[PDB]
Design an enzyme around this catalytic site. Sequence first.
Site, PDB file in Angstrom:
ATOM      1  CD  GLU B  59      -1.641  -2.327   1.786  1.00 42.36           C
ATOM      2  OE1 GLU B  59      -0.438  -2.495   2.085  1.00 42.36           O
ATOM      3  OE2 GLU B  59      -2.526  -3.175   2.015  1.00 42.36           O
ATOM      4  CG  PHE B 121     -10.076  -9.281  12.201  1.00 41.69           C
ATOM      5  CD1 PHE B 121      -8.837  -9.699  12.661  1.00 41.69           C
ATOM      6  CD2 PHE B 121     -10.432  -9.559  10.890  1.00 41.69           C
ATOM      7  CE1 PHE B 121      -7.964 -10.375  11.824  1.00 41.69           C
ATOM      8  CE2 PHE B 121      -9.567 -10.235  10.050  1.00 41.69           C
ATOM      9  CZ  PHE B 121      -8.331 -10.642  10.515  1.00 41.69           C
ATOM     10  CD  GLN B 122      -7.304  -7.353   8.652  1.00 41.67           C
ATOM     11  OE1 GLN B 122      -8.189  -7.267   7.798  1.00 41.67           O
ATOM     12  NE2 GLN B 122      -6.046  -7.657   8.354  1.00 41.67           N
ATOM     13  CE  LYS B 171     -17.401  -6.861   4.771  1.00 45.51           C
ATOM     14  NZ  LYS B 171     -16.457  -8.017   4.694  1.00 45.51           N
ATOM     15  CG  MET B 485      22.321  13.084   2.237  1.00 46.04           C
ATOM     16  SD  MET B 485      23.437  14.271   1.452  1.00 46.04           S
ATOM     17  CE  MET B 485      22.710  14.382  -0.182  1.00 46.04           C
TER      18      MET B 485
HETATM   19  C1  LIG Z   1      18.087  15.273   0.713  1.00 49.69           C
HETATM   20  C2  LIG Z   1      17.350  16.577   0.381  1.00 49.69           C
HETATM   21  C3  LIG Z   1      18.069  17.752   0.161  1.00 49.69           C
HETATM   22  C4  LIG Z   1      17.374  18.941  -0.151  1.00 49.69           C
HETATM   23  N1  LIG Z   1      18.081  20.076  -0.367  1.00 49.69           N
HETATM   24  C5  LIG Z   1      17.436  21.090  -0.988  1.00 49.69           C
HETATM   25  C6  LIG Z   1      18.119  22.176  -1.577  1.00 49.69           C
HETATM   26  O1  LIG Z   1      19.524  22.246  -1.534  1.00 49.69           O
HETATM   27  N2  LIG Z   1      17.428  23.137  -2.174  1.00 49.69           N
HETATM   28  C7  LIG Z   1      16.099  23.087  -2.224  1.00 49.69           C
HETATM   29  O2  LIG Z   1      15.396  24.105  -2.865  1.00 49.69           O
HETATM   30  N3  LIG Z   1      15.415  22.092  -1.684  1.00 49.69           N
HETATM   31  C8  LIG Z   1      16.058  21.090  -1.067  1.00 49.69           C
HETATM   32  N4  LIG Z   1      15.341  20.086  -0.530  1.00 49.69           N
HETATM   33  C9  LIG Z   1      13.861  20.080  -0.697  1.00 49.69           C
HETATM   34  C10 LIG Z   1      13.169  20.711   0.551  1.00 49.69           C
HETATM   35  O3  LIG Z   1      13.383  20.103   1.829  1.00 49.69           O
HETATM   36  C11 LIG Z   1      11.790  21.368   0.322  1.00 49.69           C
HETATM   37  O4  LIG Z   1      10.924  20.402  -0.158  1.00 49.69           O
HETATM   38  C12 LIG Z   1      11.884  22.496  -0.708  1.00 49.69           C
HETATM   39  O5  LIG Z   1      12.997  23.287  -0.496  1.00 49.69           O
HETATM   40  C13 LIG Z   1      10.621  23.365  -0.526  1.00 49.69           C
HETATM   41  O6  LIG Z   1      10.147  23.705  -1.825  1.00 49.69           O
HETATM   42  P1  LIG Z   1       9.256  25.121  -1.938  1.00 49.69           P
HETATM   43  O7  LIG Z   1       9.998  26.230  -1.222  1.00 49.69           O
HETATM   44  O8  LIG Z   1       9.054  25.447  -3.396  1.00 49.69           O
HETATM   45  O9  LIG Z   1       7.769  24.924  -1.185  1.00 49.69           O
HETATM   46  P2  LIG Z   1       6.638  23.740  -1.561  1.00 49.69           P
HETATM   47  O10 LIG Z   1       6.845  22.541  -0.662  1.00 49.69           O
HETATM   48  O11 LIG Z   1       6.762  23.333  -3.008  1.00 49.69           O
HETATM   49  O12 LIG Z   1       5.112  24.398  -1.290  1.00 49.69           O
HETATM   50  C14 LIG Z   1       4.587  25.326  -2.254  1.00 49.69           C
HETATM   51  C15 LIG Z   1       4.447  26.589  -1.663  1.00 49.69           C
HETATM   52  O13 LIG Z   1       3.736  27.522  -2.620  1.00 49.69           O
HETATM   53  C16 LIG Z   1       2.507  27.762  -2.217  1.00 49.69           C
HETATM   54  N5  LIG Z   1       1.614  27.601  -3.320  1.00 49.69           N
HETATM   55  C17 LIG Z   1       1.091  26.470  -3.759  1.00 49.69           C
HETATM   56  N6  LIG Z   1       0.323  26.736  -4.812  1.00 49.69           N
HETATM   57  C18 LIG Z   1       0.358  28.060  -5.056  1.00 49.69           C
HETATM   58  C19 LIG Z   1      -0.220  28.937  -6.001  1.00 49.69           C
HETATM   59  N7  LIG Z   1      -1.105  28.435  -7.043  1.00 49.69           N
HETATM   60  N8  LIG Z   1       0.053  30.231  -5.924  1.00 49.69           N
HETATM   61  C20 LIG Z   1       0.854  30.724  -4.991  1.00 49.69           C
HETATM   62  N9  LIG Z   1       1.414  29.931  -4.088  1.00 49.69           N
HETATM   63  C21 LIG Z   1       1.186  28.611  -4.099  1.00 49.69           C
HETATM   64  C22 LIG Z   1       2.145  26.719  -0.988  1.00 49.69           C
HETATM   65  O14 LIG Z   1       1.216  27.368  -0.042  1.00 49.69           O
HETATM   66  C23 LIG Z   1       3.516  26.523  -0.367  1.00 49.69           C
HETATM   67  O15 LIG Z   1       3.853  27.681   0.524  1.00 49.69           O
HETATM   68  C24 LIG Z   1      15.995  18.937  -0.231  1.00 49.69           C
HETATM   69  C25 LIG Z   1      15.267  17.751  -0.006  1.00 49.69           C
HETATM   70  C26 LIG Z   1      15.955  16.574   0.301  1.00 49.69           C
HETATM   71  C27 LIG Z   1      15.181  15.276   0.545  1.00 49.69           C
HETATM   72  C1  LIG Z   2      -6.728 -13.971   9.026  1.00 45.44           C
HETATM   73  C2  LIG Z   2      -6.925 -14.146  10.538  1.00 45.44           C
HETATM   74  C3  LIG Z   2      -7.852 -15.070  11.020  1.00 45.44           C
HETATM   75  C4  LIG Z   2      -8.016 -15.224  12.415  1.00 45.44           C
HETATM   76  N1  LIG Z   2      -8.916 -16.125  12.874  1.00 45.44           N
HETATM   77  C5  LIG Z   2      -8.808 -16.492  14.172  1.00 45.44           C
HETATM   78  C6  LIG Z   2      -9.434 -17.646  14.689  1.00 45.44           C
HETATM   79  O1  LIG Z   2     -10.212 -18.471  13.857  1.00 45.44           O
HETATM   80  N2  LIG Z   2      -9.285 -17.953  15.970  1.00 45.44           N
HETATM   81  C7  LIG Z   2      -8.551 -17.183  16.772  1.00 45.44           C
HETATM   82  O2  LIG Z   2      -8.403 -17.532  18.113  1.00 45.44           O
HETATM   83  N3  LIG Z   2      -7.948 -16.091  16.334  1.00 45.44           N
HETATM   84  C8  LIG Z   2      -8.061 -15.729  15.047  1.00 45.44           C
HETATM   85  N4  LIG Z   2      -7.434 -14.617  14.623  1.00 45.44           N
HETATM   86  C9  LIG Z   2      -6.578 -13.858  15.577  1.00 45.44           C
HETATM   87  C10 LIG Z   2      -7.382 -12.683  16.217  1.00 45.44           C
HETATM   88  O3  LIG Z   2      -7.924 -11.680  15.352  1.00 45.44           O
HETATM   89  C11 LIG Z   2      -6.933 -12.217  17.618  1.00 45.44           C
HETATM   90  O4  LIG Z   2      -5.620 -11.791  17.534  1.00 45.44           O
HETATM   91  C12 LIG Z   2      -7.011 -13.364  18.630  1.00 45.44           C
HETATM   92  O5  LIG Z   2      -8.178 -14.090  18.485  1.00 45.44           O
HETATM   93  C13 LIG Z   2      -7.004 -12.718  20.031  1.00 45.44           C
HETATM   94  O6  LIG Z   2      -6.157 -13.507  20.860  1.00 45.44           O
HETATM   95  P1  LIG Z   2      -6.481 -13.457  22.504  1.00 45.44           P
HETATM   96  O7  LIG Z   2      -7.963 -13.672  22.724  1.00 45.44           O
HETATM   97  O8  LIG Z   2      -5.664 -14.525  23.188  1.00 45.44           O
HETATM   98  O9  LIG Z   2      -6.080 -11.949  23.122  1.00 45.44           O
HETATM   99  P2  LIG Z   2      -4.567 -11.226  23.017  1.00 45.44           P
HETATM  100  O10 LIG Z   2      -4.517 -10.337  21.793  1.00 45.44           O
HETATM  101  O11 LIG Z   2      -3.485 -12.274  22.943  1.00 45.44           O
HETATM  102  O12 LIG Z   2      -4.356 -10.296  24.404  1.00 45.44           O
HETATM  103  C14 LIG Z   2      -4.044 -10.968  25.636  1.00 45.44           C
HETATM  104  C15 LIG Z   2      -5.094 -10.793  26.547  1.00 45.44           C
HETATM  105  O13 LIG Z   2      -4.694 -11.351  27.897  1.00 45.44           O
HETATM  106  C16 LIG Z   2      -4.467 -10.382  28.757  1.00 45.44           C
HETATM  107  N5  LIG Z   2      -3.232 -10.635  29.428  1.00 45.44           N
HETATM  108  C17 LIG Z   2      -2.019 -10.336  28.996  1.00 45.44           C
HETATM  109  N6  LIG Z   2      -1.132 -10.744  29.901  1.00 45.44           N
HETATM  110  C18 LIG Z   2      -1.788 -11.320  30.927  1.00 45.44           C
HETATM  111  C19 LIG Z   2      -1.429 -11.931  32.149  1.00 45.44           C
HETATM  112  N7  LIG Z   2      -0.033 -12.047  32.547  1.00 45.44           N
HETATM  113  N8  LIG Z   2      -2.387 -12.399  32.936  1.00 45.44           N
HETATM  114  C20 LIG Z   2      -3.668 -12.313  32.609  1.00 45.44           C
HETATM  115  N9  LIG Z   2      -4.041 -11.746  31.470  1.00 45.44           N
HETATM  116  C21 LIG Z   2      -3.132 -11.248  30.621  1.00 45.44           C
HETATM  117  C22 LIG Z   2      -4.427  -8.950  27.935  1.00 45.44           C
HETATM  118  O14 LIG Z   2      -4.934  -7.865  28.800  1.00 45.44           O
HETATM  119  C23 LIG Z   2      -5.391  -9.245  26.800  1.00 45.44           C
HETATM  120  O15 LIG Z   2      -6.808  -9.100  27.270  1.00 45.44           O
HETATM  121  C24 LIG Z   2      -7.266 -14.460  13.288  1.00 45.44           C
HETATM  122  C25 LIG Z   2      -6.331 -13.524  12.802  1.00 45.44           C
HETATM  123  C26 LIG Z   2      -6.168 -13.374  11.421  1.00 45.44           C
HETATM  124  C27 LIG Z   2      -5.154 -12.365  10.875  1.00 45.44           C
END
Ligand SMILES: Cc1cc2nc3c(=O)[nH]c(=O)nc-3n(C[C@H](O)[C@H](O)[C@H](O)COP(=O)(O)OP(=O)(O)OC[C@H]3O[C@@H](n4cnc5c(N)ncnc54)[C@H](O)[C@@H]3O)c2cc1C
Ligand SMILES: Cc1cc2nc3c(=O)[nH]c(=O)nc-3n(C[C@H](O)[C@H](O)[C@H](O)COP(=O)(O)OP(=O)(O)OC[C@H]3O[C@@H](n4cnc5c(N)ncnc54)[C@H](O)[C@@H]3O)c2cc1C
Lengths: 287, 582, 582
Positions: B59, B121-122, B171, B485
């Site tokens: 992602e 979950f998640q 969802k 760098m």
């Molecule tokens: C390793 C590294 C080294 C770097 N060294 C340098 C360096 O030597 N020199 C350098 O320049 N940069 C360097 N940078 C990049 C840097 O950190 C900044 O991203 C950059 O300097 C900022 O660009 P900017 O001043 O154009 O502002 P931007 O981040 O491009 O933001 C745009 C600005 O314009 C305004 N704006 C946007 N749209 C409009 C519009 N339609 N009309 C009017 N205003 C608008 C926004 O409000 C904002 O204030 C480096 C980056 C890295 C990762």
């Molecule tokens: C794709 C997928 C499928 C899944 N399907 C399943 C499934 O079919 N079955 C399943 O079981 N899980 C499944 N899970 C896992 C799941 O979502 C949870 O992580 C899991 O079920 C929770 O485990 P748990 O109940 O032991 O709690 P935990 O997350 O392990 O937390 C521990 C618990 O015990 C307590 N605790 C910690 N230490 C102590 C201690 N010393 N004394 C007393 N209590 C303590 C904590 O406060 C907390 O309440 C799945 C996960 C994924 C990613």
Amino acid sequence: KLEAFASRAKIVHIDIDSAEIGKNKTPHVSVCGDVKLALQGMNKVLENRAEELKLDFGVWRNELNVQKQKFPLSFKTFGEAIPPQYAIKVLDELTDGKAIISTGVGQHQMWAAQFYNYKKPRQWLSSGGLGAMGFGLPAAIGASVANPDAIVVDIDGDGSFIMNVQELATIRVENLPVKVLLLNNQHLGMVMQWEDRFYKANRAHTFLGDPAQEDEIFPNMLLFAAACGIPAARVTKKADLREAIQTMLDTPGPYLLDVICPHQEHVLPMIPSGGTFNDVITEGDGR
Amino acid sequence: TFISRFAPDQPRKGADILVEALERQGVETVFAYPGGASMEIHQALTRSSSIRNVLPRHEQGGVFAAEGYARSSGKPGICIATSGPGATNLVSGLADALLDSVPLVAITGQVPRRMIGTDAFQETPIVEVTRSITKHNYLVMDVEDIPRIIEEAFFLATSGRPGPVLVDVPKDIQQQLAIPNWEQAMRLPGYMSRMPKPPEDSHLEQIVRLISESKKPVLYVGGGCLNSSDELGRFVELTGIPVASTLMGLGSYPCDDELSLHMLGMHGTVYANYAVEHSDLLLAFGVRFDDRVTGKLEAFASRAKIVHIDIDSAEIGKNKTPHVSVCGDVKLALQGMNKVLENRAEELKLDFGVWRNELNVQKQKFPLSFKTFGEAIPPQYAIKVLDELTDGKAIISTGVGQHQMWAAQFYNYKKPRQWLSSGGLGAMGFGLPAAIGASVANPDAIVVDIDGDGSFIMNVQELATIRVENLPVKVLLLNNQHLGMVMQWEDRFYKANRAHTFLGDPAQEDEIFPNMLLFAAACGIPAARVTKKADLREAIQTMLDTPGPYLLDVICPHQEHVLPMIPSGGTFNDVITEGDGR
Amino acid sequence: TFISRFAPDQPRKGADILVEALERQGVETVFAYPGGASMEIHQALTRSSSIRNVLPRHEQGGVFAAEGYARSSGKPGICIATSGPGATNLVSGLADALLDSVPLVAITGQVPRRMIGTDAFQETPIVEVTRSITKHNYLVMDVEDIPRIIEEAFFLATSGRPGPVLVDVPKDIQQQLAIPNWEQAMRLPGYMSRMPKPPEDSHLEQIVRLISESKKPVLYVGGGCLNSSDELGRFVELTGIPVASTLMGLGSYPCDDELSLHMLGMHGTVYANYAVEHSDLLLAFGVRFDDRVTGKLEAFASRAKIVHIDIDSAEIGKNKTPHVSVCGDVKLALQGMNKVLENRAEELKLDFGVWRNELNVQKQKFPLSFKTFGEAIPPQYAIKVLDELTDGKAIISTGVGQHQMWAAQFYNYKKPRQWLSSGGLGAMGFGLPAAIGASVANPDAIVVDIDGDGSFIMNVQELATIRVENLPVKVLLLNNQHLGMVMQWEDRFYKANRAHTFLGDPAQEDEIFPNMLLFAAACGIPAARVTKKADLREAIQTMLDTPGPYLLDVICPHQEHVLPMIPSGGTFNDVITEGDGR
Ligand SMILES: Cc1cc2nc3c(=O)[nH]c(=O)nc-3n(C[C@H](O)[C@H](O)[C@H](O)COP(=O)(O)OP(=O)(O)OC[C@H]3O[C@@H](n4cnc5c(N)ncnc54)[C@H](O)[C@@H]3O)c2cc1C
Ligand SMILES: Cc1cc2nc3c(=O)[nH]c(=O)nc-3n(C[C@H](O)[C@H](O)[C@H](O)COP(=O)(O)OP(=O)(O)OC[C@H]3O[C@@H](n4cnc5c(N)ncnc54)[C@H](O)[C@@H]3O)c2cc1C
Ligand SMILES: Cc1ncc(C[n+]2c([C@@](C)(O)OO)sc(CCOP(=O)(O)OP(=O)(O)O)c2C)c(N)n1
Ligand SMILES: Cc1ncc(C[n+]2c([C@@](C)(O)OO)sc(CCOP(=O)(O)OP(=O)(O)O)c2C)c(N)n1
Ligand SMILES: Cc1ncc(C[n+]2c([C@@](C)(O)OO)sc(CCOP(=O)(O)OP(=O)(O)O)c2C)c(N)n1
Ligand SMILES: COc1nc(C)nc(NC(=O)NS(=O)(=O)c2ccccc2OCCCl)n1
Ligand SMILES: COc1nc(C)nc(NC(=O)NS(=O)(=O)c2ccccc2OCCCl)n1
Ligand SMILES: [Mg+2]
Ligand SMILES: [Mg+2]
Ligand SMILES: [Mg+2]
Ligand SMILES: [Mg+2]
Ligand SMILES: [Mg+2]
Ligand SMILES: [Mg+2]
């Protein structure tokens, strides 16, 4: 409306927070730093190139002073009713513009900002961004502790004042000379104003008095002050207002002045939210 | 007018709604690896006649291929994975796309909604994992939201500053039957209200003004210019300003051009870094002032008026504080400035020949140089030969490291999107899957992965993808038997003490290990090794002339160093111009 | 008494402090891939004489090898990566170790502290990314914290319910000189105050009581019993209760034993799932009631008194609600119950021969079965032959899929830690690097990776690691040219409609693709392919007798199905016992 704000201006923005520069309005020139230092640096340049620059904006200042005389801050006096704007102007006069002013939030807050001439920063203590009611009384407590020789006045509203009314006990126990200028309109005034402008004056829980005794001042804020051993008085007639404020200032220690005001007052001018200068409202109230 | 495979009143599975949502976005290619949580999506893909799936073998290969697809075409790249271990395998590519501003839509299957949070979950909380390494992500909680969320994902990924968007699909939502509504409005009011507006003439006039008042102007172009090739070229005609490019910007302005200063930065040319060092006007178009380019920020363009045009308001003033700034699309800003420059041509009378001549003196005193030792193959020379034999028209992808730098230095990219390289994250293993995506997106192009031996082996499993998909991917493997760098930094700063940078077999120290030719043979990909510099030209020609995939193992002496080198956080006065590991 | 390589008053780099912190934990092997952000750590590793580094070819290989090291030894596995793309390549292994409760300490280099948050070169906020897929993680912000944090990481990874801990170390902290304090106390007051206490006799007496009152008791043992092999065995002697095991528990009780019901669950034996279905007392020792085992929770052990002993209080009652529960180490609970059972032996008079006989009837009517077609190699048979020729004493690692199930069903593991398989996450590509770690941890053992063709190619690059490290790793590759488990679900539930599950070359459909023998040849690893069942026995024997690494490509008909199968969320009445893809 941001697009309409200073639509034909070169915008220079000096801010100590880099995140504010260009957050809402995009400037032409920007300085990220302490504005104190920027002013000092610009003052040196302006002083040296004085004869070279030959700065003169008298034409612009004159164009503005024309608007200043055509559309100044204005308020209306109805009979003997006390205008809240007038009460704050009198406080400004009798304190010589040297008082520390805290406020609640709402109409009284706006009038405290409009009609008091603060000569230095940190005389004005008001919740602006959050706009939290109940700020004024405890903020005055902290300002008085920090500035024990200053005149400290909480220009509060009746809704805001009651939210943290319990801090009157703090004021007495700590023997803080906190003055309360309570602009009492019996309403949640700023929300009431929006009801009048945009909801056909339909009241949705903005009246703070007792509907059973509709024409009675409720609650009786004087008894809140009395409960905490704080001298207090109420004034209703505009003729009595000047002496009442003077009494509040001259009486040592804490003092609450309940200033009754007609609730139909509106804070003006008003640019509606998100509007432009062409949408400014310059007249009207809840009458 | 789109033609659905289902009736407008016919309920179909959510997986079919999702696939049609892709079809309605114009998607033709996805990179999808099946698993339990995404089986329904894969079944629905076989029912689509307009979408082709390229099955990777990992992602990470899937997401990097989606990147190469996107970087080489300007279209969004689409990768699909199952839940849990499939999703976590996408993570490097998501982070890579975010740091480089690459438009990407990643779809992950997920456990059923009621199972979420139960350690099913998640199950992986992928939305939580990837929040800080994606522009945005989603967890779909109802089948009704699929049309809207897919549309928002593509809109967010491709609009503004491009980036990756992940969409997590449980969802049970894939199996649920529903009638999609393709007319739903997107719910992006804040994002859409903050999208930059077309640049105002107010700001564009001030820039042209600053150009006429400057005597040492330098263009500083980056990844933000990838769609402004024509406008930038016209801008250089009207101004005669020399062009320095970042790693991400390479090819926006042609490298083999007279005004090209080539790359600047840590490994940029001496004359490009010189130009920026002594410039009075820095036109920073589509750049983000990263540490590789600037070094010590206070010393970078210390005496220059800095104009920064960026589509992301958060980048303006993030590291370097500009004088003038424009938040908008640099394509539109260039168009507006080109009109002003063309009208006021005789009025402005722009001539920087004095500045250009001062730079061309540095260009001749300190050009890019490499040394030839006996019959050993210089990696720099191998890339120059590839440039010649492909006429600079090849799409080039790279890994990360020395070979990446040499691929940037010694190939003259004529157009943007020929250069596909991981710059911000710098992820090894990018080159091979990125070439897969570039070739699928550009099936008539010459596609060459200039890879290192460490980077190439990380995703070597994608050779199976190349053969099965019959993609004419060429691999120019610069094999120095080392993590080059990191080795270079060992030589410079650690007295050449080797700490796990040798990639060969210490038992047979003088044998090329591994034998990359047998990796290619395992996947039915013709391959050859070349060691003598005299044989290199014919070997590369054979790689190019042989139809289909081909791997060329180019053996190189490992003691080569990328030069020049400004040490990290250094200034132009610290540039290293000579030395290697000998 | 530890002997440092530095004087107690001598400042050394933080990287040297970190390596000595590993030495003081008894670490002898790490799996470290170098990059810029971790160069200092790698330099310090070469200065250690007691720690050996196994350089993988991919950081995912590094973390999976650390897992195999841990799963096969009971010691923590240690992997090290650089920042950014190195760190993100660890992610699948971190999630895998968390879901399977594997003790793991992962160390990642990081950009300098002041660069954090600035989108620096190769920066990834890995602490944020991995917080939800690690037991705990750290970002070290001062060189003074290295001794304490390393000690806490090993303590957290190995105590309680084991799991992975990640430690992120900025590059400037690696370079900073300091004098370590090895006497700092750990800052885990909450964790240590909640660590389970020894089981009270109150709870242990009640369990022995429930055993004497039951007539159909079933032991349900899992990964939590991996350190209780002796105690569990003694417990079975004193009670005569049949033992059903999870995927993770395999080998805790010997599979080739008379009382062994083998695995239960989705692909568990009919008689194990029968026993649990009709049991009146379920002793759930070290299990977590996952969906693969239980199916529909309401139907799982529907008429049983459920005793659940788990060291994690959060697992007790998470999915299935027990009647009696003990939160503690199952090793201690077994010891306490064994004393009670031994004393009251003549008083209790335990005899479940009637229940055991009812189960042994199911065991003979519905055993695990596979079919032999002509001379084609049954994958089930290949694993049985491996079991025979290794005398059931081999350490077995697997990928994920059909081959994983067959490796669980048809190999009789005699001890725990012979079975190394990804159960909870189920990550393909685990088998080969896990075998690397198991072999390094057990250099005199027979180590066999029973892998699938899809899973094996994902991390095929680790063949170079195996050769270079001269590890005697055997690969039993069950090659069915398909993503088999997904293919099986296509056959059962999608009318055999193939959605990208074929891994070969469709142009040469009847050719084994890829040629895994040439992958092994590329890395100097002797290999062979076997196709005829008659040749399989000698081929496996040759793999075992040939010293050093060896790959055996075992060609299998792809139409095989893992049986039996209880569909996901089903009951025992839904078990599928026959059929395949023919
Ligand atoms: C390793 C590294 C080294 C770097 N060294 C340098 C360096 O030597 N020199 C350098 O320049 N940069 C360097 N940078 C990049 C840097 O950190 C900044 O991203 C950059 O300097 C900022 O660009 P900017 O001043 O154009 O502002 P931007 O981040 O491009 O933001 C745009 C600005 O314009 C305004 N704006 C946007 N749209 C409009 C519009 N339609 N009309 C009017 N205003 C608008 C926004 O409000 C904002 O204030 C480096 C980056 C890295 C990762
Ligand atoms: C794709 C997928 C499928 C899944 N399907 C399943 C499934 O079919 N079955 C399943 O079981 N899980 C499944 N899970 C896992 C799941 O979502 C949870 O992580 C899991 O079920 C929770 O485990 P748990 O109940 O032991 O709690 P935990 O997350 O392990 O937390 C521990 C618990 O015990 C307590 N605790 C910690 N230490 C102590 C201690 N010393 N004394 C007393 N209590 C303590 C904590 O406060 C907390 O309440 C799945 C996960 C994924 C990613
Ligand atoms: C804690 C808190 N609760 C409610 C608030 C919402 N608001 C307001 C606003 C403008 O913020 O509207 O958003 S102002 C307001 C009413 C103020 O009653 P008053 O104190 O009598 O002063 P006035 O001179 O009569 O106007 C409300 C209810 C608030 N800000 N804080
Ligand atoms: C996933 C990954 N892991 C480790 C990396 C740390 N780095 C590098 C760097 C610059 O990012 O240092 O930070 S480059 C590099 C070694 C490159 O080996 P080669 O492919 O053979 O190319 P060459 O021509 O020899 O130099 C490593 C180990 C990385 N970036 N990605
Ligand atoms: C990183 C990864 N990606 C995809 C996966 C989804 N799954 C599977 C599953 C059960 O987890 O389904 O969820 S198993 C599987 C295919 C296994 O191909 P094989 O290695 O050849 O073994 P076989 O003997 O043929 O079955 C896939 C594609 C996975 N788990 N890990
Ligand atoms: C070996 O088990 C297997 N294999 C294959 C090829 N596919 C499936 N599918 C499946 O279990 N679907 S599920 O009922 O909705 C489901 C239920 C609970 C948790 C997860 C989950 O699915 C998501 C991850 Cl598979 N299972
Ligand atoms: C090609 O550049 C290169 N190559 C190699 C082999 N090593 C280094 N090292 C390095 O840049 N160290 S650093 O100054 O502290 C540093 C500063 C800023 C951001 C990151 C960073 O390091 C962490 C990631 Cl390298 N750089
Ligand atoms: Mg008046
Ligand atoms: Mg009020
Ligand atoms: Mg030459
Ligand atoms: Mg190399
Ligand atoms: Mg047989
Ligand atoms: Mg298979």
